[PDB]
Amino acid sequence: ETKVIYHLDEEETPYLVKIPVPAERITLGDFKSVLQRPAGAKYFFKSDDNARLPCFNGRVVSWLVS
Amino acid sequence: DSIVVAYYFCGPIPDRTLVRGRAVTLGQFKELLTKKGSYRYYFKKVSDEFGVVFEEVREDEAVLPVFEEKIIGKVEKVD
């Protein structure tokens, strides 16, 4: 289970969602399967569905744009 | 014995309600709601686990976090 903190658009306080996939396999596909966000948002990270998400100490940090 | 609740129903700031205090539960919050099943709940919590967040709560038995002296929350719908 990986903790993912994402800033939605530009809201003050971000969101924290736990994804039941250990951080070795944390994919954008998993992030989408969790969020189930209308299309088509873009994603950035702090550092494709098959590609993994960069996480240090089991924390993913991301940004979303509608 | 009873605490204040204020949430966002996707968007609303519905009026701060009193809720009885036996540790307010997620199910205790969503029993105030109808036509659910596809709602999604977050609650502003003091945590910069490595400043504050809106942690998603999905279990009808989880304690709801307390911000300030209330339970500031945010419920939004899927599609």
UniProtKB/Swiss-Prot annotation, chain A:
Subcellular location: Cell membrane; Cytoplasm, Cytosol; Cytoplasmic vesicle; Nucleus
Domain DIX: 1-66
Post-translational modification: Phosphorylated by CSNK1D. WNT3A induces DVL2 phosphorylation by CSNK1E and MARK kinases.
Domain of life assignment: Eukaryota
Function recorded in the entry: Plays a role in the signal transduction pathways mediated by multiple Wnt genes. Participates both in canonical and non-canonical Wnt signaling by binding to the cytoplasmic C-terminus of frizzled family members and transducing the Wnt signal to down-stream effectors. Promotes internalization and degradation of frizzled proteins upon Wnt signaling.
Similarity comment text for this entry: Belongs to the DSH family.
Domain remark in the UniProt entry: The DIX domain mediates homooligomerization.
Subunit structure: Interacts through its PDZ domain with the C-terminal regions of VANGL1 and VANGL2. Interacts with Rac. Interacts with ARRB1; the interaction is enhanced by phosphorylation of DVL1. Can form large oligomers (via DIX domain). Interacts (via DIX domain) with DIXDC1 (via DIX domain). Interacts (via DEP domain) with AP2M1 and the AP-2 complex. Interacts with DACT1 and FAM105B/otulin. Interacts with DCDC2. Interacts (when phosphorylated) with FOXK1 and FOXK2; the interaction induces DVL2 nuclear translocation. Interacts with MAPK15. Interacts with PKD1 (via extracellular domain).
Full protein name: Segment polarity protein dishevelled homolog DVL-2
From Swiss-Prot, chain B:
Expression tissues: Ubiquitously expressed.
Subcellular location: Cytoplasm; Nucleus; Membrane; Cell membrane
Modification comment: Phosphorylation and dephosphorylation of AXIN1 regulates assembly and function of the beta-catenin complex. Phosphorylated by CK1 and GSK3B. Dephosphorylated by PPP1CA and PPP2CA. Phosphorylation by CK1 enhances binding of GSK3B to AXIN1. ADP-ribosylated by tankyrase TNKS and TNKS2. Poly-ADP-ribosylated protein is recognized by RNF146, followed by ubiquitination at 'Lys-48' and subsequent activation of the Wnt signaling pathway.
All copies of domain DIX, residue ranges: 1-79
Residue location of crosslink Glycyl lysine isopeptide (Lys-Gly) (interchain with G-Cter in SUMO): K74, K77
UniProt remark on domains: The tankyrase-binding motif (also named TBD) is required for interaction with tankyrase TNKS and TNKS2.
Assembly with partners or alone: Homodimer. Interacts with ZBED3; the interaction is direct, enhanced by protein kinase GSK3B and casein kinase CSNK1E activities and decreases GSK3B-induced beta-catenin serine and threonine phosphorylations. Component of the beta-catenin destruction complex, containing at least, CTNNB1, an axin and GSK3B, that regulates CTNNB1 protein levels through phosphorylation and ubiquitination. Interacts with CTNNB1 (via the armadillo repeats 2-7). Interacts with GSK3B; the interaction hyperphosphorylates CTNNB1 leading to its ubiquitination and destruction. Component of the AXIN1-HIPK2-TP53 complex.
Disease per record: Hepatocellular carcinoma: A primary malignant neoplasm of epithelial liver cells. The major risk factors for HCC are chronic hepatitis B virus (HBV) infection, chronic hepatitis C virus (HCV) infection, prolonged dietary aflatoxin exposure, alcoholic cirrhosis, and cirrhosis due to other causes. Caudal duplication anomaly: A condition characterized by the occurrence of duplications of different organs in the caudal region.
Function: Component of the beta-catenin destruction complex required for regulating CTNNB1 levels through phosphorylation and ubiquitination, and modulating Wnt-signaling. Controls dorsoventral patterning via two opposing effects; down-regulates CTNNB1 to inhibit the Wnt signaling pathway and ventralize embryos, but also dorsalizes embryos by activating a Wnt-independent JNK signaling pathway. In Wnt signaling, probably facilitates the phosphorylation of CTNNB1 and APC by GSK3B. Likely to function as a tumor suppressor.
This protein's name: Axin-1
Gene designation: AXIN1
Full protein: residues contained: 781 to 862 of 862
